[PDB]
Structure formats: C-alpha cells, structure tokens
C-alpha cells in the first residue's frame, strides 16, 4: 500500500516535503519524494510519525468528570478508590476501548498502563489495533500485595509480545504505597524478566523520601518509566542520565490536582530522556496528548520563552516515547513500523502553511484525520473501522447506569 501525494514529516528535526509513503506488512517499505501513484491519495494533508502516551489509566475513562475540586489525598482515598470497587471486568476492556477511540483520534499509536483487571485491558488493546506496554498497578502491606505482583505475572505469561503490539511490564504504584522490602522484590522481578517497570515517582510535595533507596535496588539496571516527577530533587539528575530512565511528565493531572509544576527543561538540559503522558481521564481529564505537549511547552516557556522548542516537543510525543514503550517507531524511515497519523492542513490553525511544524504543538488542536498502527487504520476519517462503534455505545451507555 501508497499513501501520499501530499506533505510528509520523516521525524521531528526534518521539513515537511511533499511525497507518499508505502507500507507492508506493518513496516515502512519506502518513502517516496515528489509525484507518484497512491493507492490513497491524501493531498492537502500531513503524514507524520504516530504518538506514544507513556502513562495513563485506561478504564479510568469510565470516571471522567467524576471527581472535580478536590485535593490529591481526597481525590484519591475519598473518590476514586471506592468506584473502582465497582469497576469490573467488563467495565475495563469497554472503557479500554472508549480510551482507545479517545487517543485514537488524537493520533495515538501507543500507551503505558497501569490498572488492574489488565488481561481485560489486554483484550481490548488486542481488538482495537493499538500497541501497549500493560502494567499492573502494585501495592502492599509489609509484604502482603493480596496477589497482585502474581496476576502481574499471569498477564505478562499470556501476552507479552502478543502480536508485536503488546509488551508486559510491571508497576508498583509509588515508593509510599509500595514498602521499601516489596519494592525490591518487584523491581528483582523485573530485573530476571528484562521487563519494564513503571511508577509514580515524587508526584506530590510531602514524598521526600531519598531516591537512593531505589538506585541502588534495581534502577539502575531496569528500563522505568517513572511519571510525574514533579518533585524529583535536581541532584539526581545527573545520575539519572545514563540509565534507562524515562520521565513521563503529566502537565495536565499535575496542575488539576495542584501537585505543581516538573521542571522538564532543566531535567532535558542535564541529559535525561523525557516522555508525555496523560494519565487517567478523571485527573486531566482528557487522553490527548498534542494538548499535553502544549501544555507542557507552555508551562516551561513560563519560566523562558526559549523552553521547549517545537522540534523537542514534537521528538517527546514521537520518537522519545515509542523509545520508553520499546518500540521501533516514531520516524517514517525504511524499516521501522508504519504507525503514522494524518493531520488536516485545510483549517484555519495551519496556517500560514509554511510554519505547520510550529502550529502542530502551538495551534492545533489534536483532532487527527486518521491514524495508522502496524500498518492498520485505527481510526480514519471519524471512523473507527477495528470496532463496532454502536454497539461499543450502547454497552458504555448500560455501563453507565450499572456503575453509577
Ligand atoms: N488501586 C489498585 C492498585 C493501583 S492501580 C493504579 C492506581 O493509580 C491510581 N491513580 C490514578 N491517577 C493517579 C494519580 O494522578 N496519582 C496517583 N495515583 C493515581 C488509580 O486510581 C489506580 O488505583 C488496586 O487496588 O489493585
Ligand atoms: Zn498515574
């Protein structure tokens, strides 16, 4: 398959140019410049490199909207906590696919989770067409995690590497939910599966703890994606530069529930790798992440309007991102994967059209044309061709009710 005959973006530090791309088997065959035959022709648009969500909470869609005005503390033990007693199996793969629409029409190829219920969660990501790296959520008494590092272990025996899409790793929530003996534990677990892990990592002002009880356990060693990081002391940062240490800054859920601001361009300046993630619907409560990048350029242009430039934002939300996931995607270049996105250069945000670049995280809005994984459309044209939409609907619609 061609697509083209219309502007295309390699990767963030290039100029669009006009020309198709072909796609075989879920990899890039070729890039073509110029006129040629397209088996689609998208004239008057943009193709560039997919998106990378590095940290949500999938089903968590299901509680948008829910919890609003209140403190971290009570919007966590107070809201949250008692609804997802409620939420089931079911509730998790349909709000997994409501997730997966969401980010989807926001030119999303891929997202961290971390969740429980995570074999429903893998179910939907296997019918939806998105790649994943699934986590379970993780947390413990003295020890006692009532079975959850061992359901972890059950989802990455089924469906790590399903498919080339879904990859499996593991997710202690935080270093205060998790006790210093069990996280050890975890990250050793990971440690023996090379597989990933993932947490929340100095989100909120009271964590003060010393990160030198966890380089010295395991991250080191493990590829972590740890989000938030707010309140990260700068003295790591150095260290932290080196090992397969990613940051996933969550601009929107930091600000929502007034945990403040990550300083993310001192973090880029002494060499740290940093990613974009949403979180969950019901602290940002969207799952878009071109308004994450902006967001999180706008916040550091704050401190110097030279923060943030277009080319590293647009690198966070591509390239940098499918790097955390572990995937070969985020350039349209021969061999890597075909998860690409088509952007509308006929609206009023695009232009002046020589400065599309700059409008991509300054002006627009996400609304994507249609987005591509693994060689698939996931969603095109406001259609999402994997999946029965009405039915899809009507499931959320009776999930409402039963839920609330
Ligand atoms: N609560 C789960 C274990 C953690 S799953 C991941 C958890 O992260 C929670 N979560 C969502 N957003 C945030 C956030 O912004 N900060 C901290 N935790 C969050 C989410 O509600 C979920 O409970 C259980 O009992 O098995
Ligand atoms: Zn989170």
Redesign the pocket.
Same mark, same amino acid.
């Given at each position: 398959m061609i697509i083209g005959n219309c502007l295309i973006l390699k990767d963030f530090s290039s100029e669009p140019f006009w020309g198709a791309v072909e796609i075989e088997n879920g990899t890039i065959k070729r890039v073509l410049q110029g006129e040629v035959k397209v088996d689609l022709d998208l004239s008057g648009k943009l193709v560039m490199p997919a998106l990378f969500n590095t940290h949500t $909470?999938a089903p968590?869609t299901l509680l948008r909207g829910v919890a609003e005005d209140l403190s971290?503390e009570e919007?966590?033990f107070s809201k949250?906590?008692p609804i997802?007693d409620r939420l089931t199996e079911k509730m998790a793969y349909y709000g997994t696919i409501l997730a997966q629409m969401e980010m989807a029409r926001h030119g999303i190829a891929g997202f961290v989770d971390?969740?429980?219920h995570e074999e429903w969660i893998a179910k939907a990501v296997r019918d939806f067409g998105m790649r994943a790296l699934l986590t379970?959520?993780?947390?413990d008494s003295n020890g006692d995690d009532?079975g959850?590092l061992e359901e972890n272990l059950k989802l990455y025996n089924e469906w790590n590497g399903f498919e080339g899409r879904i990859f499996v790793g593991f997710?202690p929530?935080?270093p205060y939910?998790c006790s210093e003996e069990y996280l050890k534990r975890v990250f050793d677990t990971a440690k023996s599966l090379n597989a990933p892990v993932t947490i $929340?990592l100095y989100?909120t002002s009271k964590e003060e703890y010393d990160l030198e009880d966890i380089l010295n356990i395991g991250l080191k060693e493990v590829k972590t994606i740890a989000a938030?990081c707010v309140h990260l002391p700068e003295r790591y940062f150095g260290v932290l530069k080196d090992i397969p240490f990613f940051v996933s800054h969550?601009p929107a859920?930091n600000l929502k529930?007034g945990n403040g601001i990550a300083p993310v361009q001192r973090m880029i300046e002494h060499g740290m790798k940093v990613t974009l993630g949403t979180?969950?619907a019901?602290?940002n409560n969207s799952l878009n992440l071109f308004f994450e990048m902006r967001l999180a350029s706008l916040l550091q242009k704050a401190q110097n309007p030279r923060n943030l430039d277009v080319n590293t934002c647009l690198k966070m939300v591509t390239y940098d991102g499918a790097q955390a996931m572990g995937f070969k995607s985020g350039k349209i270049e021969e061999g890597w994967n075909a998860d690409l996105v088509v952007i509308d250069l006929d609206l009023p945000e695009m232009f002046p059209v020589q400065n599309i670049k700059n409008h991509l995280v300054h002006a627009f809005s996400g609304e994507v044309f249609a987005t591509m994984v693994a060689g698939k459309w996931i969603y095109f044209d406001g259609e999402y061709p994997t999946i029965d939409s009405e039915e899809v609907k009507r499931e959320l619609a009776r999930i409402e009710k039963e839920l609330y």
């Open positions: $909470h968590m971290f919007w966590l949250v906590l997802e971390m969740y429980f379970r959520g993780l947390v009532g959850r997710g929530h935080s939910l $929340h989100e938030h969550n859920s529930l979180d969950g019901a602290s």
